Design a protein around this ligand. Structure first.
Ligand SMILES: [Mg+2]
Length: 859
């Protein structure tokens, strides 16, 4: 920070507002097109939404830094060094395919996740001159067009586009955690109320760029733009913009890290045992290359990405359009679901039930009062208005339409949460009818009609009305109170201020029948381990009653007022053991989701509201609907076609299947590779030659992975997808430790069979031995898949899908017939005598039966 720029801000904050208009050449009405153009030409332009794009060459490097590709490149270069061009070329092709696949996937991710902030859809509210004749108005212009000395208006949830001086403010609060480091918002006043000057960042009359407005409204004037902002650049995200990678790529990286760990503790050991026993350190390093390449699945990223892609494709037919590949991983493992009640628990169809007055008696004059407000409205079509319109009879409707004529209408606004319609049956007096939320109705009503008699509205009547609508809400009934007022005829236009001293004729009640499909869906969601939570903005009574029909156990309720007082940890503790949250603002939903995220649960939020998008952004997975507002869809992570918990439940089941397959392949390949590597290690000392060469091991792995291409099409047992899928190397390591030595035992048997029975006990005839262990190693690896895929019995209690069973047969045929081919010469393999095949079959059958029997010892 420059000291010179640290004094101009203080001077402007302490400068009188009277002289501020002339200093920046700004008028109270605003800035015209010519004035704005001159200011832009002279001072410059503000921070443009455009940012530095990632070059094609630069993106390839970050697309390559992942540890798996580094390990593969190291192995390929080493194989090139040790006079092995074929293996090095194959490894190079594998790493190139991996890089291209990661490239296309990362381009898709960048399309899905361009940056932390779009900075393009963000605009600013400026006065300007819309009519160009001094009429002015309100415009939504990009922040880049904000010139210095421009009058702007601030509202809650709007980030500061540039440095501004507060001219007028009404309870304006700004979160300056980025600049000042304080999370607590600092109130901003029109005049500097701070006693001590010389603190430009702490000045209450100055707001800097990069900060947001927590609450309140204000009208400030821009003082700096472009590089003149105290933030400086605030847009130099040229490189390392996506510091956090996909959780999917993170999973692949940690899986590769486990195997790298195993290599770094096993390859040196082999180098020692064979290399000290014999003394040929070149062959010792060749053994080290063999063990290092033994456990390194070549197409691990290819198979995992294929599995996730197939999951995403088959979810598309289940009305679950998943945006990103990574989203499936979080979708399977999700265990807490936070949804609003309207549209998921209850169908959005809203029928009308009852015509009660303040006394609760069924009164039809309340329907007469309500019908005019709905019919004589010219605003946006309302489904509730059509409901109350249908509620009334046709003859009475025609009589009312003939008797009354529309005069004026008050549009519905969130500030008052009410809408009023002015109608008149004659030219002497006019009748104003207003409907809305109950509390806002009593706030504007001073008298009520009790049993058809006008009575002053005292406190006892307020309490009795509160009790009766409390009973209505406990029934599950959305109460809407209707108010009427008689005023003399006038030529003026009625405004929101005219809704005062009205007479509350009665209350109308509406109910939402819960979806017929939602009860089994909620019963099944708990059968999948998913805990359903309701974060609803409606009344606590209505939500509690709604939870009863569906079958969800409301238990004790939590009101959004209480959660405001609590801190992060206590609120997280409360939210862990509570199911329903009511009377919630969007920030409350975001905070509750973030606090639920802490303990490790993968929390997903489902919403289709305009203000619901930040909750979608915060959660581990944001589920929205195609029929929602566009911004929510762009901020989501799964856009299912229609709001239904049955569709989401089936989507979760399929997203668990995709995870079970993707993890099952990892465990199978890791265990088999570790078994082969262990066998190489234990027999490294005794064999004067390599058990199997790297070119032999690499081809075996490639063919096994080709047989692993059908894994995404496998049939997952219902036991696997019955709980959230967790991914941790702690269990992968012990699975490898258990299921490696079982393979190593039979590989030792194969070593002994070659050494003694077939007399391949001389380094001049190592090819028969090396070739011989290759056929059995490649056959057993693919054959053990059917034994170890399922905890239950291998063929009579749980079978495998056709693609998997087939590809296994094809790879077996390729492996057996590979030595009997011209390709044997280039692969350093040779033909095998017919006496081998019965021994091969015996070894494979023994390995299968043994492994199936031992299998029960995991638990
Ligand atoms: Mg093996």
């Amino acid at each position: 920070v420059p000291p010179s720029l640290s004094a101009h801000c203080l001077k402007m904050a302490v400068m009188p507002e009277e002289e501020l208009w002339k200093t920046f050449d700004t008028h109270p009405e605003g800035l015209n097109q010519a004035e704005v153009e001159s200011a832009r030409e002279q001072h410059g332009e503000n921070k443009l939404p455009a940012q530095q794009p990632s070059p094609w060459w630069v993106h390839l490097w970050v697309c390559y830094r992942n540890p798996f590709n580094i390990l593969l490149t190291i192995l390929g270069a080493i194989s090139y060094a040790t006079e092995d061009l074929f293996a090095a070329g194959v490894i190079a092709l594998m790493v190139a395919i991996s890089t291209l696949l990661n490239f296309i996937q990362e381009a898709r991710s960048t399309k899905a996740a361009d940056a932390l902030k779009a900075m393009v859809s963000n605009t600013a509210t400026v006065l300007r001159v819309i009519n160009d004749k001094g009429e002015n108005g309100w415009l939504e212009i990009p922040i880049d067009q904000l010139v210095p000395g421009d009058i702007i208006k601030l509202a809650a949830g709007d980030m500061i586009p540039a440095d501004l001086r507060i001219l007028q403010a009404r309870d304006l609060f700004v979160a300056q955690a980025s600049l000042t480091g304080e999370s607590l918002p600092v109130e901003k006043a029109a005049t500097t109320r701070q006693p001590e000057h010389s603190n430009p960042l702490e000045c209450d009359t100055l707001c800097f760029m990069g900060t947001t407005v927590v609450s309140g409204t204000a009208q400030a004037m821009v003082i700096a733009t472009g590089a003149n902002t105290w933030f400086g650049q605030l847009a130099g995200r040229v490189s390392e913009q996506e510091s956090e990678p996909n959780a999917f790529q993170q999973g692949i990286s940690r899986v590769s890290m486990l195997l790298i760990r195993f290599m770094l503790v096993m390859a040196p050991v082999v180098l020692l045992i064979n290399g000290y026993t014999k003394g040929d350190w070149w062959e010792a390093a060749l053994f080290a290359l063999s063990v290092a390449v033994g456990l390194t699945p070549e197409m691990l990223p290819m198979i995992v990405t294929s599995t996730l892609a197939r999951g995403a494709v088959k979810l598309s037919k289940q009305k679950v359009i998943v945006k990103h590949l990574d989203a499936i991983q979080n979708f399977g493992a999700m265990d807490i679901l936070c949804t609003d009640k309207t549209g998921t628990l209850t169908q959005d169809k809203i029928v009308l039930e009852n015509h009660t007055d303040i006394s609760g008696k069924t009164s039809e004059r309340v329907l007469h009062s309500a019908w005019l407000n709905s019919h004589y409205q010219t605003g946006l079509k309302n489904l509730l208005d059509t409901a109350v319109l249908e509620g009334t009879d046709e003859e009475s409707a025609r009589s009312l339409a003939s008797r009354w004529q529309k005069i004026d209408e008050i549009p519905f606004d969130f500030e008052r949460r009410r809408m009023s319609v002015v109608v008149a049956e004659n030219t002497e007096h006019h009748q104003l009818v207003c409907k809305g939320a109950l509390q806002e109705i009593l706030n504007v009503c001073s008298q009520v009609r009790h049993n058809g008699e006008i009575v002053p509205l005292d406190d006892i009547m307020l309490r009795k009305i509160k009790r009766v609508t409390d009973t209505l809400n406990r029934q599950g009934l959305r109460v809407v109170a209707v108010a009427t007022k008689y005023l003399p005829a006038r030529e003026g236009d009625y405004q929101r201020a005219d809704e005062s001293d009205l007479i509350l004729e009665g209350y109308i009640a509406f109910l939402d029948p819960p979806k017929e499909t939602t009860a089994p869906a909620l019963k099944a969601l708990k059968a999948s381990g998913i805990t359903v939570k309701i974060l609803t903005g409606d009344s606590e009574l209505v939500a509690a009653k709604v939870c009863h029909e569906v079958g969800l156990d409301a238990g004790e309720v939590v009101i959004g007022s209480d959660i405001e007082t609590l801190s992060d940890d206590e609120l997280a503790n409360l939210a862990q053991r509570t199911t329903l949250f009511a009377r919630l603002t969007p920030m409350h939903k975001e905070r509750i989701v973030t606090l639920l995220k802490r303990e490790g649960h993968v929390v997903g939020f489902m919403g289709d509201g305009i203000n619901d998008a930040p909750a979608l952004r915060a959660a581990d997975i944001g589920i929205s609907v195609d029929g929602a507002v566009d911004i929510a869809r762009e901020a989501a992570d799964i856009i299912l076609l229609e709001k239904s918990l049955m569709v989401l439940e089936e989507g979760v089941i399929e997203g668990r299947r995709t995870f079970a397959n993707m993890l099952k392949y990892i465990k199978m390949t890791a265990s088999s590779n570790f078994g082969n590597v262990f066998s190489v290690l234990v027999a490294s000392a005794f064999l004067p030659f390599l058990p199997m060469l790297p070119l032999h091991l690499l081809i075996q792995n490639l063919l096994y992975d080709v047989s692993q291409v059908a894994i995404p099409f496998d049939n997952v047992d219902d036991e696997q997808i019955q709980k959230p899928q967790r991914w941790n190397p702690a269990d992968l390591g012990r699975f490898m430790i258990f299921f490696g030595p079982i393979s190593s035992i039979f590989d030792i048997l194969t070593f002994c069979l070659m050494w003694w029975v077939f007399h391949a006990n001389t380094p001049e005839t190592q090819t028969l031995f090396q070739s011989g262990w290759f056929v059995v190693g490649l056959l057993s690896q693919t054959l053990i898949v059917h034994m170890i895929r399922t905890r239950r019995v291998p063929f009579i209690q749980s079978c495998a899908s056709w693609p998997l069973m087939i590809m296994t047969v094809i790879v077996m045929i390729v492996g057996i017939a590979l030595p009997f081919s011209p390709l044997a010469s280039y692969l350093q393999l040779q033909a095998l005598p017919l006496s081998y095949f019965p021994w091969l079959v015996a070894i494979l059958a023994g390995y299968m039966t043994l492994t199936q029997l031992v299998k029960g010892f995991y638990s």
